[model samples]
Target: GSHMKNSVSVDLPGSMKVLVSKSSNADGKYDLIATVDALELSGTSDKNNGSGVLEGVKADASKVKLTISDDLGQTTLEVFKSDGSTLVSKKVTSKDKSSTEEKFNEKGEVSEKIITRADGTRLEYTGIKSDGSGKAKEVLKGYVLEGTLTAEKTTLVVKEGTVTLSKNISKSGAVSVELNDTPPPPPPKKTAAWNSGTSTLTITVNSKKTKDLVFTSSNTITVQQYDSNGTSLEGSAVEITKLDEIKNALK
Candidate 1:
């Protein structure tokens, strides 16, 4: 039997939900996967007793590098593809409530980056191509907002009583904006009320004129019209027996 010297596996408690291992492969990569709140890493010996609680620790053999220092108060994690050098994603979080996350495309280029500052301002950059062209958006706390980038244009919405900006870029760039403080009017309302005593269903738009569908019997119905001021119009009623006749009359 061959001897294996560099392979180790340890099962943690059920409450810990962690797995730690050192592979025997040529790379001899270390793996740590945990769902616990924190993990304490302490070196052996009193003189080398460096220890810290690492939160949200996730690592695997697939080239994920997570580093946490004892006194830095910041954590950085970088994930790579199978090639190792091809960084797929990265995230850095600081204790001051700021963080940055970056996502890379297949070419190992940053495709999107999101940064949140300590003061609750968030900035986003997206649509980055190989030429390093992209759109940036900034959002500040307390009702200040910035623009968003789309495939063909960028749109900005501000809250100084609601201002809008529209920028278009085809092969050239153009900027146009409009300032309006008045809110748009509400949509028109359509209401339908059924009166069982009168055997009629009244349909009204904005509570104006009514289109009354009177059911004379199970098979017979009549359509009655009204003016915009809720006055019934004379000689505007039509009676029908067949459903198709009613549909044709409405048409």
Candidate 2:
């Protein structure tokens, strides 16, 4: 058999380690990989920090996945669109499981989101909260709410907060309440190394030609930010592009 060389190179974060699987399968594809254990990727000037492993692969789209265990103490998956928008995401902890699926408008903003929780609670948010109004639905509750934000208050119905529907009335008896169409909020942050423990990250990829697999690991990830003894400040996360988005963006 002739030798098939499909050498691959990557410019990974300084903290990550890269590795490759030299062996090939009956086919002729080569594998390459990398990882960052105890990842330190963060914000706020890298002063505040957290801990979590960032694992990724350079394999087929079907094989791409990420696992975070050290700090988060859970497993989560994210499916991203070619435009770097989140198509769906799921998280599983020992006590509960939660998942969210989002639809995007042409402009790339969230058009809708369906959220499911392990306790059998489900909710759907539709439309961007642009004009002070949107749609929402309580899946199990069988009630829908739509509201429009105003200077004085958000008016979804004749009343505020909760609504009691009459059994005799059909769709006409009730109008969707306020804020139903707004997109759902972001997911919680991964657990940081508050306990002062160790974290690891790894990346693995498979060969297209052969059954070869490659991997790499590193200690690049660490606590990037944390709540201080002072007052807590918060803000919604800016949208991000995931590893899958890069390949998708390529023509």
Candidate 3:
């Protein structure tokens, strides 16, 4: 379902307090105006923890502006009056099965090229199945780091570190995690690469197509920033209010 929409302004207090609002539907899509987070939002603790009113849900109001503050940390996202109507929303879920695969032939005479990786780490090629009978193990990219997806699996496995595919061929998804070992320094850093000469190109970053952000401060607030429609921002007057004032308005 959907979350916040057709709403008016929002009132934010400190950062730590939880702001729970009803979802428009079970899907939890919010074409919202403001989101304030004191920290990088991740995991279930932060999901569906937002609020905004539906458009035209109120009388006499054409635009919706929301005031948000990250009580958990210090981050805040505010949408100003300049922001036009229309809300965008999305939801995310974890994956238990893969939808794609990375493969290499193991039985062909030309298959020798697919052996060990340049890093000298041995790769698996079991059974040498000449036919397309070789099985594959699941290997997610960047298994050690949660956010990166740049690794591959050579074999199939039933465990986290390693697995065996259709053939006796075995593979492991286990990866080393160390700051200095950072993937072998990106394959020996090739020399400076760029266009030979400058071409007549005047790139004007067109931000008018996307939302924009502006930052401001007040006596009660240490720092606050909000987004106006468009990628390029022009800070006009931000009708910023204090926590006390917002609570009163919601009344």
Best-performing candidate as measured by TM-score: 1
lDDT per model vs. reference: 0.58, 0.35, 0.28
Residue 52: error of model 2 in Å? 5.2
Off by over 4 Å in 3: 1-11, 14-25, 28-46, 51-58, 67-251
Which lDDT tens digits does candidate 2 get at residues 72-121?
A: 33444433444334433333332245555566565545566666656655
Cα deviation at 147, candidate 2, in Å, is 6.2
Ranking by lDDT: 1, 2, 3
TM-score for each of the candidates: 0.39, 0.30, 0.15
Off by over 4 Å in 1: 1-61, 148-251
| Candidate 3 lDDT, 1-251, residue by residue in tens | 12234443333333222234334335555334333232212111223333323222223332333322233222222222223433221111112111111232322121211223323333333333444333322223443111211124232223232331121232254543212222323333212222225211111223222211122233332212224443343445234356764344222
